[PDB]
C-alpha cells in the first residue's frame, strides 16, 4: 500500500539515486538536450526545475545552496549567468519530455528531455 | 500465382516466431511492413527480411506491382537444433537444445 505517496525507487539505494539524479541534472544543464528512460525523464523535472527557480535570484546564499546541491562550479556559473535571466518571467515549466520509442538493448521506453528555449 | 521466399537458419525457436507470424497473415504488404517496423520482438526483423525478399522477387522476376500484393500464406517450420551440456549442482549435467526455425512466405495477387 502506497496511498498518496510520491517518489521513485528504480531499484537503487537512496545515495545512488540521489547521485544519479544530480548527475542527470548536471548533464542536462550542460548539454540542454539529453535522451534517457521514460521514468527517469519524468522524475528529472522535480529535481531540475527547483534549481532553475532558485537561480532566478542572484545572491551569495543562493549560489552556495546551488553549489551544495550540484557540486559543480561550472554548472552553477552557467545556471546563474544564462538560465536565470532566460526564464525570469516564465512561471514554471522549463522542461519538455517527449517519448522517443524504445531502446534496442532491452526494449526499455526512451524519452528526450529538452529545454523550452534552447539555441 | 504465389511468389515464394524461404529463410533457413533463423537462430530462433518456432514457438516464439509463430506469435509474430500470426499478426501479418492475410494483411496487405504495406500494413504488414508498418506493423513489423514498429514492433519490439526479435523475430520481427527476420519476418520483415523475408517479406522484403518476397516482395523484391515478385517485383523483379514476375514483374508484379507492389500495391496489389498482399501476404497470402506464411508459416514457420522447425529446424536443426544444437545440443550442449550444462553443469548442474552435485555433479549432475543437463542437456540444452538451441532451436532453429525456417520461415516461408508466399505473397500473391
Amino acid at each position: 500500500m502506497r496511498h498518496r505517496n510520491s517518489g521513485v525507487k528504480l531499484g537503487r539505494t537512496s545515495s545512488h539515486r540521489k547521485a544519479m539524479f544530480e548527475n542527470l541534472a548536471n548533464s542536462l544543464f550542460e548539454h540542454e538536450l539529453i535522451k534517457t528512460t521514460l521514468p527517469k525523464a519524468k522524475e528529472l523535472r522535480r529535481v531540475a526545475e527547483p534549481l532553475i527557480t532558485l537561480a532566478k535570484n542572484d545572491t551569495v546564499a543562493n549560489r552556495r545552496l546551488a553549489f551544495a546541491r550540484t557540486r559543480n562550479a561550472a554548472t552553477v556559473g552557467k545556471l546563474f549567468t544564462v538560465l536565470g535571466p532566460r526564464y525570469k518571467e516564465r512561471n514554471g515549466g522549463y522542461l519538455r519530455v517527449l517519448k522517443a520509442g524504445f531502446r534496442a538493448g532491452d526494449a526499455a521506453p526512451m524519452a528526450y528531455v529538452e529545454l523550452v528555449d534552447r539555441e | 500465382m504465389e511468389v515464394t521466399a524461404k529463410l533457413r537458419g533463423a537462430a530462433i525457436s518456432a514457438q516464439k516466431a509463430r506469435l509474430v507470424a500470426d499478426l501479418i497473415r492475410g494483411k496487405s504488404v504495406a500494413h504488414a511492413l508498418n506493423i513489423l517496423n514498429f514492433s519490439n520482438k526479435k523475430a520481427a526483423v527476420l519476418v520483415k527480411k523475408a517479406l522484403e525478399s518476397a516482395i523484391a522477387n515478385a517485383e523483379h522476376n514476375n514483374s508484379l506491382d507492389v500495391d496489389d500484393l498482399k501476404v497470402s500464406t506464411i508459416y514457420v517450420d522447425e529446424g536443426m537444433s544444437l545440443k550442449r551440456i550444462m553443469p548442474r549442482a552435485k555433479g549432475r549435467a543437463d542437456r540444452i537444445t538451441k532451436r532453429t526455425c525456417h520461415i516461408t512466405v508466399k505473397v500473391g495477387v
Partner: protein, 55 residues
Amino acid sequence: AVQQNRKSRSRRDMRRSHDALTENALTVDQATGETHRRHHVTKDGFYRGRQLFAK
C-alpha cells in the same frame, strides 16, 4: 510436485489460446506525412510541428 500423466496437445493449445499478440497505434503525421507511433517523436526528429536535431 510433478504431473502424473501427460498433458494432451488439446489442453496445451487451449492454455496457449491467450498468447496472441496485439498491434500498436500507428498514425500518419500531419507535417511529414509518414507513419509513426502515436504520441511519439518521428525517427527523423520531428514531432508536433517542431524539429529536433536541426540540420
